[PDB]
């Protein structure tokens, strides 16, 4: 019923859609080095206004992140494919200084769509394996987290947004992980509060 | 000789080229509503960094103005054509909320002239504004063409300034076909850019 509210509340101001978009894009972009503050990003999303000091790459990648988010929500229920992911990537790196993999990725995808039920463990494993394959030059973190959110929303799972911190718990969690051992990432994701339960109002 | 110095310093930073680019783009963009200050514009051109409050369109149009400027200088001494102007336009409005016979007559008229002067530049300017070939960006494209024509014929380089832009628009208003005198008086009122920054090229 949550997804229903997300789609229905899309056009109204300060809604579930806009809040989720803001938090997710804020943390996900801040991990990758965006210098947008919460108010600067909110201002950019809402009124298309840029404030504070930023590189051109930061701004363009941010705007692209907004478009990619919208594309991800609009293209829910779609099967994750390589050309799909490349569409998201090229949409993400548009107008920037950028302007063995396929079989392993296909294997990962099949593994994902062979599950009887999807859980935080499955999503986390998909995340680490996707990062391990590393199909793209950059944005594997961003694209990967987008896919992660997509998977969470599609399967009515609790919405956990990877949050930036001062000790870098996310990256360290991915590092401590290894093949066959995804427990640190699962612990990290479980550590995070459910977004559904934060803004239940 | 000014042109030679302009070309030599094209690749150089904090040079005559960058001074001309900075001033010209500053005034030409500020006329159209850009909120970039001189320090913000200098920072953006030199280090590719955005500061202060701007719309996305302002930023993108500014950067586009930089690229278009570079393209205009690189295609000096080249003849102005419809595909050229359309190229300038598409380069100008890239990634923004948006994205003929009379014109040919004007172009042929320009390239049939024995000599080019401020009178020809002004007449071409007003006629270009009158045709208004593009939906938007006509002022910018037009001023680019003006600068191109000035540079090609070693004419005095006069940059249409935002301080004077009310006088520019009003002089443009007083103009009519066959009468481009107010615009000529206006351009003559403006200081020659060459003679302002003599330290950079002269002696």
């Amino acid at each position: 019923s949550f997804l229903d509210k997300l789609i229905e509340t899309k056009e109204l101001k300060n809604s579930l859609y806009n809040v989720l978009k803001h938090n997710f894009l804020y943390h996900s972009n801040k991990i990758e080095g965006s210098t947008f503050t919460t108010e600067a990003l909110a201002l950019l999303l809402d009124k298309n206004v840029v404030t504070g000091r930023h590189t051109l790459d930061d701004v363009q990648e941010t705007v692209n992140s907004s478009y990619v988010f919208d594309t991800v929500i609009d293209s829910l229920k779609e099967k994750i494919t390589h050309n799909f992911l490349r569409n998201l990537h090229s949409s993400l790196i548009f107008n920037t200084t950028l302007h063995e993999v396929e079989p392993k990725l296909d294997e990962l995808i099949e593994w994902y769509y062979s599950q009887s039920e999807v859980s935080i463990k499955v999503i986390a494993e998909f995340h680490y394996r996707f990062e391990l394959i590393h199909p793209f030059q950059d944005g594997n973190g961003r694209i990967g987290r987008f896919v992660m959110l997509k998977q969470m929303l599609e399967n009515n799972l609790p919405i956990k947004i990877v949050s930036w911190d001062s000790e870098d718990l996310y990256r360290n969690s991915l590092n401590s992980c290894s093949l066959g051992n995804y427990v640190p990432l699962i612990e990290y994701l479980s550590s995070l509060e459910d977004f559904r339960e934060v803004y239940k109002m």
Side-chain angles (χ1 to χ4, degrees), chain A:
Chain A
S1 159
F2 175 80
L3 197 56
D4 307 45
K5 191 184 180 180
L6 189 66
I7 301 302
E8 285 185 290
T9 54
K10 183 175 39 60
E11 303 298 332
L12 81 97
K13 283 197 168 77
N14 181 332
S15 54
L16 180 57
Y17 184 93
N18 295 28
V19 177
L20 177 59
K21 188 173 178 178
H22 176 60
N23 291 349
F24 179 80
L25 288 183
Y26 177 56
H27 287 333
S28 179
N29 292 347
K30 179 147 189 176
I31 289 180
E32 300 292 348
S34 179
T35 60
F36 278 91
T37 61
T38 57
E39 299 181 355
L41 178 63
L43 185 54
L44 181 56
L45 294 184
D46 294 337
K47 285 170 186 173
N48 281 18
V49 174
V50 179
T51 52
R53 186 188 131 143
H54 309 296
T55 68
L56 272 178
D57 288 341
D58 188 13
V59 183
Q60 188 65 58
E61 283 174 356
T62 303
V63 180
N64 285 342
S65 295
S66 176
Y67 279 94
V68 168
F69 185 94
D70 291 343
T71 308
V72 163
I73 304 296
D74 289 348
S75 61
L76 278 183
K77 293 213 187 153
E78 288 212 344
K79 176 164 146 195
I80 305 168
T81 319
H82 195 59
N83 288 335
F84 171 79
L85 295 189
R86 299 188 163 147
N87 180 30
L88 278 55
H89 182 222
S90 285
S91 168
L92 189 57
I93 64 165
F94 169 70
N95 197 34
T96 55
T97 63
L98 327 168
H99 287 307
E100 65 162 343
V101 181
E102 294 178 350
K104 282 209 291 177
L105 193 59
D106 290 344
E107 175 180 323
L108 179 54
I109 296 180
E110 295 180 0
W111 171 89
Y112 176 81
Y113 285 114
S114 76
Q115 299 294 325
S116 68
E117 196 213 13
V118 187
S119 63
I120 303 297
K121 305 191 178 280
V122 180
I123 294 181
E125 178 173 350
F126 191 99
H127 196 41
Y128 178 80
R129 284 169 78 182
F130 182 79
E131 294 284 349
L132 197 65
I133 298 176
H134 208 86
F136 303 109
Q137 162 266 345
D138 187 66
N140 283 275
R142 271 173 302 198
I143 296 297
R145 290 183 287 266
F146 273 118
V147 171
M148 199 169 83
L149 178 61
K150 174 159 183 296
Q151 292 167 353
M152 295 185 181
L153 287 173
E154 286 181 344
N155 297 280
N156 196 253
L157 294 182
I159 304 302
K160 302 168 165 301
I161 311 295
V162 171
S163 309
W164 168 86
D165 45 282
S166 304
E167 190 58 52
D168 293 9
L169 293 184
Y170 167 65
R171 293 184 157 267
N172 288 9
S173 175
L174 281 188
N175 293 347
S176 293
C177 280
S178 59
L179 255 182
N181 191 29
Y182 317 100
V183 184
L185 185 53
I186 299 175
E187 293 179 1
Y188 174 74
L189 299 187
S190 67
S191 302
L192 303 176
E193 299 91 346
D194 193 359
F195 175 83
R196 321 186 303 186
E197 209 71 6
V198 179
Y199 298 107
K200 224 187 94 178
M201 50 180 171

